[PDB]
Structures are given as C-alpha cells and as structure tokens.
C-alpha cells in the first residue's frame, strides 16, 4: 500500500 | 506558503516544443506523485500527466499519442512538462497540481488537492 | 471507456435557493472493496484553477462550506448547494479516480438568476 500525501489514502479503508 | 508557482509556457510554433515549469513550497514534495490538467476550449478540463514520488514512473492521456514528457527535480521541488510536436489543439492553459492518493498493485488512485495559478500556452506562428 | 457527462450545462439559480448539479459515469465507480464510490467534485471560478470540494463522492474536504452536500451511488452522482451565495456562482466539475486514467465531466455553470 502507497500513499501520496494522506486525504485519500486515510480515508479509503473504513478502519 | 503552502503553494505550486508556475512559470514558463507562452507562444510556441506549430510543430515546436515548450516547457513548462512549477516550484512547490511549503510541503514535503518528494510525499507526493505531481499531475499537469489543462483547459481548452475544444477539451475541456483535461488530465494530461502525472509522476510518482521519485521521479520514476510516469503516466500519460493516451490521446496526446505521446507528445507530452513530465519530469520531475526532487533537488529544487520543481516539476516540469514538455509539449513536443504542439498542435492548435493544444492551446489553453496548463495547470500544475499536486496529487493526492493512494496505490495498490491495481495502480494509482487520486484526487488534485491544491493547483498553480495556471499558464497560458499559445500554439501560433 | 469512462465517460462522465454533466448536466444541465449551466443553471441559474436564485441566492438563497438550492442548486442540483448532476454528473452520470457510463461505468460503475462503486468498488465493493471498500464500498467507496472515486468520484470527486471541484469548483473553479472565473480567472482561478480549479479547487477540490469533495472526495469519495460525498466527503466533503476541509475548509469546504457544508452548504455543499454530494450524494449518489455507482453510476449516478449529485452535487447539491444549500443556500446558494453569490461566492457559488462558478462552473462545477465531477472527476473519476476508478482507473489510472482519470477524465473530468465537461463542467456545469451555476449563475445567479435576477
């Protein structure tokens, strides 16, 4: 799992 | 500051290439995959071209037939895109937008978060 | 492959009054993985780039007024103004991020009705 930056990445799981 | 500060474009000839430039501040660049979108009148607002973190790995709208190069300098914060072989399609103005995401082995997922001002690009002889 | 398609194409709409905005993907963006659809919303004003108002098609992002709500499932989107301010009036866009290939609608101009 990747992220770039965090407002997406953070919020695409529930958990 | 948080913000993206565009600089080149202007008037290219038909046929020639152009470069366009933009400087991040006020956030840790190398977090984040960066995108260019531009507006035309004929288009539409148009997503062209983004890049990962490190500069490796880079992503273009099929339609550009492959005209368009983006790169990225970690060591300046700075990232660029080149128009090659421009066409009077490809007049409008070009935007810079850090992207926001996140990556699976599926691919890239993401959303513009925050803009440059824009350029014009102007394809004339 | 995925087209969205925006309508109506401009709007004029009372200050004060609500403001629906549609936006229809010809493919399901609704992933049951996480049960998100990968839509966002954006606002851009005349002369100003585009601006980020919504993600996971109903998440609005921070600093964004609550007047503005967006809602739908899979194939059919709606971005709703609540009280409209004369600081709304602006052309709306939906955006996919379903794929790798992410396109943007054509846009909706809100104005204001006199």
């Known amino acids: 799992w990747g992220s770039s930056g965090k407002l997406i990445s953070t919020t695409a799981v529930p958990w | 500051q948080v913000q993206l500060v565009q600089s080149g474009g202007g008037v290219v000839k038909p046929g020639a290439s152009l470069r366009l430039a933009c400087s991040a501040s006020?956030?840790?660049?190398?977090?984040?995959?960066m995108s260019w979108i531009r507006q035309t009148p004929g288009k539409g607002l148009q997503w062209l071209a983004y890049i990962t973190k490190d500069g490796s790995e880079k992503k273009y709208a099929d339609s550009l037939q492959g005209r368009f190069a983006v790169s990225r300098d970690n060591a300046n914060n700075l990232v660029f895109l080149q128009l090659n072989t421009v066409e009077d399609d490809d007049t409008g103005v070009y935007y810079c937008?850090?992207?926001?995401?996140?990556?699976?082995?599926?691919?890239?997922?993401?959303?513009?978060?925050?803009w440059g001002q824009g350029i014009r690009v102007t394809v004339s002889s | 492959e995925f087209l969205l398609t925006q309508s109506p194409d401009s709007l004029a709409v009372t200050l004060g009054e609500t403001a629906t905005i549609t936006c229809r993907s010809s493919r399901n963006i609704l992933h049951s993985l996480n049960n998100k659809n990968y839509l966002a919303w954006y606002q851009q004003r005349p002369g100003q780039a585009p601006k980020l108002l919504v993600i996971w098609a109903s998440m609005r992002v921070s600093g964004v007024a609550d007047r503005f709500s967006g809602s739908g499932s899979g194939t059919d989107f709606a971005l709703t103004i609540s009280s409209l301010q004369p600081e709304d009036a602006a052309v709306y866009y939906c955006?996919?991020?379903?794929?790798?290939?992410?396109?943007f609608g054509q846009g909706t101009r809100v104005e204001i009705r006199r």
């Open positions: 006020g956030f840790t660049f190398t977090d984040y995959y």
């Open positions: 937008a850090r992207d926001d995401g996140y990556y699976d082995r599926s691919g890239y997922y993401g959303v513009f978060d925050l």
């Open positions: 955006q996919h991020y379903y794929t790798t290939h992410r396109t």
